[PDB]
Automatic annotation (TrEMBL), chain A:
It comes from the Eukaryota. GTPase that associates with pre-60S ribosomal subunits in the nucleolus and is required for their nuclear export and maturation. This is Nucleolar GTP-binding protein 2. It is found in: Nucleus, Nucleolus. Belongs to the TRAFAC class YlqF/YawG GTPase family. NOG2 subfamily.
From TrEMBL, chain B:
It comes from the Eukaryota. Keywords: Cytoplasm, Metal-binding, Nucleus, Ribosome biogenesis, Zinc, Zinc-finger. This is Zinc finger domain-containing protein. The keyword Zinc applies. Residues 49-78 form the C2H2-type domain. GO terms for molecular function: nucleic acid binding; ribonucleoprotein complex binding; zinc ion binding. Pfam families: zf-C2H2_jaz. InterPro entries: C2H2-ZF_Maturation_Protein, Matrin/U1-like-C_Znf_C2H2, Znf_C2H2_jaz, Znf_C2H2_sf, Znf_C2H2_type. It comes from Chaetomium thermophilum (strain DSM 1495 / CBS 144.50 / IMI 039719). It is found in: Cytoplasm; Nucleus. One of its GO terms (biological process) is ribosome biogenesis. GO terms for cellular component: cytoplasm; nucleus. Zn(2+) binds at C51, C54, H67, H73.
RNA sequence: GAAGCCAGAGGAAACUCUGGUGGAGGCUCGCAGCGGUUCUGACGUGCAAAUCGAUCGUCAAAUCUGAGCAUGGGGGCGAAA
RNA sequence: GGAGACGACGGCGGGGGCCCCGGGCAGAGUUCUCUUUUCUUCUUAACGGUCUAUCACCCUGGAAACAGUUUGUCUGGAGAU
RNA sequence: AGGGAAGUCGGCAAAAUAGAUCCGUAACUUCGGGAAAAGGAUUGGCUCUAAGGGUUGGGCACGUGCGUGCGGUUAACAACCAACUUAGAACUGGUACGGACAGGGGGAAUCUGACUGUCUAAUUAAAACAUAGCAUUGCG
RNA sequence: GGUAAACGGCGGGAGUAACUAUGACUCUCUGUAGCCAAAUGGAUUAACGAGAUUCCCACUGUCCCUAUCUACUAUCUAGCGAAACCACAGCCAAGGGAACGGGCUUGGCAAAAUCAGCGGGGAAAGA
RNA sequence: GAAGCAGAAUUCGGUAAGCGUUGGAUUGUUCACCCACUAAUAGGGAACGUGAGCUGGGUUUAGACCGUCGUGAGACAGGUUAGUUUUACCCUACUGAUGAACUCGUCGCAAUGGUAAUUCAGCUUAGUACGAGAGGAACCGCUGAUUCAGAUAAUUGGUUUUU
RNA sequence: CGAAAGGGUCCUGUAAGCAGUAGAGUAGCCUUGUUGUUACGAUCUGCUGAGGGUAAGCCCUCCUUCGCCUAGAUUUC
C-alpha cells in the first residue's frame, strides 16, 4: 500500500493498486533488481 | 460533467439518498453504520476526509475545503435546508395517519 | 519553453538560488494539403481496369507542388522494393 | 560605382482595404404588446501640386554619481544624452 | 433491465475518456525528458464588487504670441476619452451546466529499430532502406 | 622474404638430446554485499513507433439472449433495360467389376401456369 | 436377472436410441488434460476411402531478418513478422404464397404425411420398514422446479418519428 | 358509411399574458430614508393538475352537425 501510494499506483478513487505493485515487486525480484542470494552451507 | 452519463441511472451506479444523509447528520450511529459498510483501506485519503452532506470521500483536507466552496456542496446544503422527502411527508400529502391507540 | 538579457537574495570572487524576459528545436496536439494504418467495413459484370466511408500517419521540414530543362532499353533512375 | 539583383523563420511598429460601434438625412421592414427600433445608400481612380512621415546623416558640446534605450540589451571620447 | 469478456484464436467492434481553471504527478533517464504521467476538485444563469489605461493642462520679473533671469517637484491634482481580460461575492434553476458541436481511455511490462525520414502506384509500411556517428582502403 | 593477420587454425605451462623452419620425447594442470580501477563498473541503453506480445483498472449488446426504432434498398407500379453462362436437360432409392452417373435396369412415384425468399447441390473463382 | 444385496449407496449383466448428454480455465502447443454444475455430462457416421458457407492452425508466391549449410547465386534442422478471389437474377431441392378447369358459396368427412414431451426436488408415507449402532428407504396421495414445445401482453421491464 | 365536433380514457407537467410591500443587488429623484420613492433585475408566487396532444391498429354518441347511397364495368353449368 505504501509503495502504491508513493509510486502513484492508484485505481479509480485513489485506491492503491496492490496487485500491480505486487507484480512489479515480483518482476524486480526475478530480474535482478532486488539483492538476494542463498548462502552456501558451512562445512 | 458526469462520468459515464449513459449508465448513471443503473442500480450499481447508485448514490446515497438525501433522507439517509439527514439521518447521518442527525445521528452518528447511522453514519457509523454506513462507514462500517465500507473498507477504510479502499477509501480516498484512507477515509479520514469525508463530507457528510455530499456523502463523499476526498483525498485531502485541501480537497474537502476546496469542494465546500463549490456549487454542488451548496446545492446539497440548500436541499438539506429545504428538507428531504420522507414517508411521513408522503402520508401527510394525502392526509394519512398512523393510529397506534 | 533552449541560448541571450533584467531584477532581487547569497558568495572574497567563479558561481548558487528565486521571479521575470525571450522564442530555439529535422520538438509536440491539431485544421487545410500530402500520405495510406485498421475495419469478418461499402463496392466486387463497381461511380472507379484500385473508387467510397469511418479511423489513422504527418503537418515549418529529409514538407507539398507548377512550368521549363536533363538522363533512353546492351540503357536510365533508384533513402535498394 | 549604383540600380536591375534576390534565402527561410520569429515577434514589434506605420499605412490601405475589410470587420465592428455611435450620431444624422432619405427609404424599406416589424408593430397583440415592446422596440426614439432592425436593415439599406452615404463613394472618390490613374496622374500631379503642396505639407508631413521610422532608419540614417550633419552642427554645438564633451558624458562615472555612467547615460540613452527596445516586447526582445544594444548603443556611446571612433563623441553618447 | 441484471450480470460485466462468462464471447472470441485474439476485448475485433462498440462503449468509456476528452475543452478550460486549480491541486497534484512515480520508476527510469543520454538530466534534455518521462508528463496532458497517475490520481483528484470545479464549469449554467443573473446582480454586483475590485484590479489592470490614454490625451491635455503649472507661477513671477522684464523685452514683446515668443526670448531670457529666476523660483517648485503633493499635477500624490483636475478635465475629457477609452477597450478587453482577470479575480472575488451574493442570489437563483437543475435529472443535464465544454448541456448541440468539438474533443487523450489510462496503466505494468517484454521483444524490437536509436530518433525525424523513405519504398514494393494496383495484396506485404516493417526488426527492410536511409540517416548522423564510427572504422578501413586507394589517390599529390 | 614481411603482413589487412582479413579468412582461418588454435586446451595450457615447463624443459631438453634435436639445435632454423615442422621440432620430437618426457613432466604435470583443477562481502547479506568485497577489492581495485577516473561519481561509475553499464547492453537489464533513455526518448520516439499506424512494429510484434502478456496482463491490470475503467468501460461496455462480445455475449448469456435476444428485443425494438429510423433512413435507403429489397417489394409493387410507370418508363427504361443489360451481362455472365448455356451439348441436351434437370425428383429420388438400389444395382450398373475398371470405387463415376443425370440418360441404362428394377422400384418409389408422378397433374397446368406461377410469386417472394434461400443457399443442399447442378452451375458459378480473368480456377 | 444376479451378488452379504439388512436399509442406504452400489457392482455385474439383459431389453431398450423414446428422451437428454452442459459450462468454463489452460496455445510456453501433437491443445490434450484439469475444476465445477449435473440425472448424466456415452461413443460414433453422414468430410478426413482428395475436394467453393464463415473463420483460427498443417501452410508454404512476391517484402524482411535471426540460426544451419554453401565461395556464391541461394538452399534448409529450423525460429519470427506482414501479406487480393469478389456468385446466384438460372434449373432443381427446401420454406412460405397464389392459383385455371368442376356455377358460386356455406357446413363438414379424413386417405395420407408429420407428431412431443423430459428430468429432478420438496411434503406425506416416516425417523417408519430395516438396523448392534451410525444411519435409513419405497408404493398410493400432494406441490413446485430443469430442459423442450406451443401461445400471449393484464402486469413489470426494454424499445420512441406519437418527433 | 365518412368527415368534423363533444364526452371519456391516457401522455406530458402548470400555457401566453397580467399582477405582486417576493427577489441578491445596482443606479436615479427628493421627504435624505423612516417597505423613502422610482427604474432594471436570473428567478419565485397567483390566476393554472393549467396549456398542448389523443388513433393514425383507444372507447362512446338513432338522441351534436355536415355530406354520401338502391351505382359503373366484366364474367358465369
Amino acid at each position: 500500500e505504501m509503495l502504491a501510494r508513493k509510486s502513484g499506483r492508484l485505481l479509480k478513487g485513489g485506491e492503491p493498486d496492490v496487485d500491480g505493485v505486487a507484480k512489479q515487486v515480483l518482476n524486480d525480484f526475478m530480474r535482478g533488481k532486488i539483492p538476494w542470494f542463498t548462502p552456501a552451507p558451512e562445512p | 460533467g458526469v462520468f459515464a452519463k449513459r449508465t448513471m441511472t443503473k442500480t450499481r451506479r447508485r448514490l446515497r439518498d438525501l433522507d439517509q444523509i439527514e439521518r447521518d447528520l442527525r445521528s452518528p450511529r447511522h453514519l457509523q453504520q454506513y462507514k462500517e459498510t465500507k473498507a477504510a483501506e479502499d477509501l480516498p485519503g484512507l477515509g479520514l476526509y469525508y463530507c457528510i452532506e455530499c456523502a463523499k470521500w476526498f483525498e485531502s483536507e485541501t480537497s474537502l475545503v476546496g469542494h465546500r466552496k463549490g456549487k454542488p456542496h451548496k446545492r446539497r446544503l440548500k436541499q438539506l435546508k429545504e428538507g428531504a422527502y420522507t414517508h411521513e411527508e408522503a402520508m401527510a400529502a394525502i392526509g394519512y395517519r398512523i393510529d397506534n391507540g
